[PDB]
């Protein structure tokens, strides 16, 4: 129907955040401390609250480990604390609200600026606060061209401190809790203008909410030796002593700042490269012990079942075979060291899905660095020849720099047959020989083919009907050429 | 008379029958996931009678299944204007007495919605009809399965319990042992 | 740096079927690929007037000879040419822009002959 | 939807290769199987059998965000060449 | 993974009956790598606009 079409980051939806609440602060200790054991406790680091161990009742998801999407829960602490980011904002923009009046930003005006703001794209409303960056609280209260000047308040850059005196300005400063202002008046004055998205009020650092435990792994040693986790925002549970309760707000926000604010790989392989020219230009070949690398869909089809069962009976230690085959009932069964299997009811036991080895393309991809062209990874065939090199028709070493120091090379494995057919017949025969970046062939006699063929062409060389021998590696030759 | 409902849901046509017969297969697909308990309000294991149109029958970007949607008509049993039927007493309970009509399964009936003197005798879990007519204490002892000509008002879908309530005590007829 | 930055900055380019490129909001970047509409994929020998002469050199339809000074016969073939790609048109603007220069090229071929 | 005039008498190679891919999935789930059902009879080469289609009775519909639905039957136009 | 998540009373949870919010009208089942979900989580602490919506693949 519809997958993602327009998505951005995620946050705390407070409702679904807090129905999954189990415990905020059970006691002074956690991790089943006082039990002198560790059955499963205490109700927040366990069950779930975010599925960070082998199994427990996953909340709104299930089951372990993945597909238990991060579970939420109210772990509120209610430690007095405020907006550190808006601490800095208030310090910088110097009381942008014009506290404690919060009068209308503009007056009449000139509605030209009004309609210009209302009929322009976003990322622009900062100009209103820029206009009132300085004039805020130093102006005529209830006047034209703005409504600020109330009430003589400018903020001081005393670090994270926001000291708001009834400034002249520059003539009313004090040093030790006098001439201060509380962020609660800022909160009330909320209660650049857009509360649809830009709400500083709800970001108050008093109803702090936690990301789920899917961020944090805990390496329980099965030995009770080290269970470190990172970071995380729940750690302030140990401050229950101060949880009972202007410079005090600065101290609280300083304590907060400690722990509040600041297509890779699939189905791969890498070995060394030393090729053959016996591999027809489209074909390539891999090692043999890449067939020991598996767990392929190759979903069974009706015309295929018998040809699949032929290799299904082989198992773990035969090249043309099968292993770990995905069963009909979503419970895949192995033919590896626990195999002792392959009775294989001939139409149903894997009637959905099978998984074989590299028999014939079955395309594979080859990696290079740096990938100068898009023709440094191309589509080409298989089957299969041993001696774990990266062998391929040596006329196409140019767009790979398949350098021959013996420095290794990377192989892919694509296990999805949707655009695999599309890939194999679009960038397999037209990608190689013709580039749009230059218009010049990449495939070419790299070396001695050049001089060997040259020497053939040299007006000297006269041959024998007995030298129909060398003819016959070419046009009386390997697969797909034996006409006369 | 039974209400046809326009419905729009995902249709997952398997590739097994991409070229085979369509219309009846489409109907089977529609009946696939319109089951009794919980699909939507109002919907419970029901079907269609006429076509309207068949919209975009996508496959996928490149994946297996299909992306057909629904334009059809769904034969629901909406709770109508108290349509007169026969309501068989489905069960018994101290809170209320269960009834069966034909729309849903569970039909709660409060005590006073029984005959006004007829109470639930929890000493025997029998809603004995204290049929206090003709001045007589004629206790019409009828357990689960009491014959009552029910007509119901409402239907429910969301709560932890398909529960109904058919309003009884007809002023024009009375005699809830029959009506 | 510059390779990854060029790749990171220049992905949205597309080639939708109106012969015109479009952008994240479908804003026109081009209308043709330079009149020709061509791109360097099929850059055959010199495009495509000298190598193809050799291509048809190598498959010899023997019956013909110089009797009528075929230059005029070449002009008649230019006429059947003028007819045979005025059925040109499709996704177009790629043949009329060069059809007359084609004609001029065969005309100079006839003059050389 | 007769807005089919602004395509060369050829489908593009990208569209053709991807329709071959989706026909691969088709003939790889159970069967839409075609003119020869399994006359080409081989083991697990899923893709390389419906490549030999050369009829392809299916429709594909190509667009532009500021344009309508330029539709095309596979039959009614020329092939990869 | 086609996990279920949306903006209208929905989050990273079940599909058929979301114990987060089983409104029954907000089932999405969207393909997404777990990296974006980790971004969701780690940015829950560091507040930022959480835009979430869908659109029709069809006409």
């Amino acid at each position: 129907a519809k997958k993602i079409s327009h998505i951005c980051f995620g946050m705390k939806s407070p409702e679904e955040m807090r129905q999954q609440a189990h415990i905020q602060v059970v006691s002074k200790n956690l991790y089943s401390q006082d039990n002198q054991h560790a059955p499963l406790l205490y109700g927040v680091l366990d069950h779930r609250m975010g599925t960070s161990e082998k199994d427990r009742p996953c909340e709104t998801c299930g089951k372990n480990l993945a597909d238990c999407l991060g579970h939420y829960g109210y772990i509120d602490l209610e430690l007095p604390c405020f907006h550190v980011g808006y601490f800095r904002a208030v310090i910088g923009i110097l009381q942008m609200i014009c506290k404690t009046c919060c009068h209308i930003m503009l007056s009449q005006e000139e509605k030209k600026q009004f309609l210009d703001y209302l009929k322009r794209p976003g990322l622009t409303y900062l100009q209103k606060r820029g206009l009132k960056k300085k004039i805020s609280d130093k102006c005529r209260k209830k006047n034209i061209c703005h409504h600020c000047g109330a009430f003589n308040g400018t903020v001081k850059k005393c670090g994270l401190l926001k000291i708001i005196h009834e400034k002249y300005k520059t003539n009313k400063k004090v040093v030790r809790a006098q001439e201060n202002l509380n962020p609660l008046v800022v909160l009330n004055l909320f209660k650049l203008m857009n509360p649809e998205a830009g709400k500083p009020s709800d970001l108050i650092l008093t109803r702090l909410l936690v990301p789920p435990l899917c961020i944090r792994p805990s390496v329980v040693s099965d030995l009770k030796s080290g269970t470190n986790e990172d970071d995380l925002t729940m750690k302030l549970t140990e401050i229950i002593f101060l949880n009972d309760v202007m410079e005090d707000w600065d101290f609280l926000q300083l304590q907060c700042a400690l722990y509040i604010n600041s297509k890779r790989v699939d189905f791969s392989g890498r070995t060394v490269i030393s090729p053959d020219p016996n591999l027809r230009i489209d074909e390539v070949a891999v090692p043999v012990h890449v067939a020991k690398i598996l767990t392929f869909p190759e979903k069974v089809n009706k015309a295929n079942i018998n040809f699949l069962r032929k290799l299904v009976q082989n198992g773990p230690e035969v090249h043309p075979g099968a292993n770990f085959i995905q069963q009909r009932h979503t419970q895949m069964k192995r033919f590896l060291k626990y195999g002792n299997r392959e009775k294989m009811a001939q139409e149903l036991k894997y009637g959905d899905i099978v998984e074989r080895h590299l028999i014939d393309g079955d395309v594979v991809l080859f990696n290079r660095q740096p990938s100068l062209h898009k023709l440094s990874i191309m589509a080409h065939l298989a089957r299969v020849k041993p001696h774990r090199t990266f062998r391929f028709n040596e006329c196409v070493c140019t767009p790979y720099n398949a350098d021959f120091d013996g420095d290794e090379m990377n192989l892919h494995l694509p296990q999805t047959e949707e655009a695999k057919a599309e890939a194999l017949v679009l960038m397999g025969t037209k990608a190689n020989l013709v580039t749009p970046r230059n218009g010049e062939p990449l495939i070419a006699a790299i070396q001695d083919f050049l001089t060997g063929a040259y020497l053939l062409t040299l007006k000297d060389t006269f041959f024998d009907r007995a030298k129909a021998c060398q003819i016959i590696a070419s046009i009386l030759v390997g697969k797909d050429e034996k006409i006369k | 008379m039974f209400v046809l409902v326009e419905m729009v849901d995902t249709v997952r046509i398997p590739p097994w029958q991409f070229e085979r017969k369509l219309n009846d297969s489409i109907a089977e697909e529609l009946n696939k996931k319109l089951a009794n308990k919980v699909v939507y309000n109002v919907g419970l294991c029901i079907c269609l009678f006429d076509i309207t149109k068949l919209e975009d029958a996508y496959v996928f970007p490149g994946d297996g299944a299909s992306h057909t949607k629904v334009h059809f008509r769904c034969v629901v049993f909406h709770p109508f204007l108290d349509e007169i039927l026969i309501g068989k007493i489905k069960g018994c309970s101290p809170e209320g007495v269960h009834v069966s009509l034909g729309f849903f399964d569970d039909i709660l009936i409060p005590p006073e919605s029984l005959q006004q003197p007829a109470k639930f005798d929890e000493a025997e879990q029998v809603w004995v009809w204290e049929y206090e007519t003709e001045e007589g204490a004629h206790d019409l002892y009828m357990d689960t399965g009491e014959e009552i000509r029910f007509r119901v008002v409402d239907e429910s879908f969301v709560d932890t319990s398909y529960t109904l309530v058919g309003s009884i005590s007809e002023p024009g007829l009375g005699l809830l042992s029959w009506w | 740096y510059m390779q990854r930055r060029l790749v990171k900055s220049l992905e949205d380019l597309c080639s939708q079927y109106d012969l015109t490129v479009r952008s994240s909001t479908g804003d026109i970047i081009q209308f043709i690929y330079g009149g020709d509409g061509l791109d360097p994929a099929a850059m055959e020998g010199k495009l495509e007037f000298k190598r193809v002469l050799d291509n048809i050199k190598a498959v010899f339809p023997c019956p013909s000879e110089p009797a009528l000074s075929k230059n005029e016969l070449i002009l008649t073939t230019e006429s059947i040419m003028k007819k045979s790609e005025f059925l040109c048109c499709q996704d177009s603007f790629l043949q009329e822009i060069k059809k007359f220069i084609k004609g001029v090229s065969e005309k100079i071929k006839k003059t050389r002959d | 939807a007769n807005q089919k005039r602004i395509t060369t008498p050829y489908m593009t190679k990208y569209e053709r290769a991807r329709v071959l891919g989706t026909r691969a999935l088709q003939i790889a789930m159970c069967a839409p199987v075609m003119v020869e059902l399994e006359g080409e009879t081989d083991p697990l080469l899923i893709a390389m059998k419906e490549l030999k289609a050369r009829k392809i009775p299916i429709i594909i519909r190509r667009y532009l965000p500021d344009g309508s639905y330029e539709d095309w039957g596979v039959d009614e136009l020329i092939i990869t060449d | 993974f086609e996990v279920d998540v949306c903006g209208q009373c929905g989050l990273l949870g079940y599909s058929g009956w979301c114990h987060y919010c089983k409104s029954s009208c907000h089932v999405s089942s969207l393909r997404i790598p777990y990296a974006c979900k980790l971004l969701f989580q780690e940015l829950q602490s560091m507040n930022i606009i959480p835009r979430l919506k869908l659109s029709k693949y069809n006409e």
Binding site: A89, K199 | - | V7, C14, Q16 | - | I49
Partner: peptide, 29 residues
């Protein structure tokens, strides 16, 4: 400050795992 981010092009698509939609990936029958 509640300001949006401009990482919403198409290079994010590979980290975000969604189908591309331009030229031919915008199918609307």
């Amino acid at each position: 400050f509640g300001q949006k981010d401009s990482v919403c092009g198409v290079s994010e698509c590979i980290i975000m795992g969604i189908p591309m939609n331009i030229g031919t990936g915008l199918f609307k029958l």
